[PDB]
């Protein structure tokens, strides 16, 4: 049983750290996506003068 | 009869000492088991934050 624990079971510290990092990455990517879609607005300024 | 006494009969001093030691061992093991089952709460602590 203890060997099966060493084989199939997961370690919660690493999982929690990885999940927190992944959530941080997701929010950061969402913000960068918003900025990227905001970038092309300069062409409207070009056209208007 | 006395020869049979030296063979099949028990010595109460040794038996009482063993009984007391066994009771102490049982209670100590119960306490250690309680502590062992109490250990894994740190994972709940991790998940909470």
From Swiss-Prot, chains A, B:
Superkingdom, natural source: Bacteria
Subcellular location: Secreted; Bacterial flagellum
Family the UniProt entry places it in: Belongs to the bacterial flagellin family.
Annotated function: Flagellin is the subunit protein which polymerizes to form the filaments of bacterial flagella.
Descriptive protein name: Flagellin
Species of origin: Escherichia coli (strain K12)
Organism lineage: Bacteria, Pseudomonadati, Pseudomonadota, Gammaproteobacteria, Enterobacterales
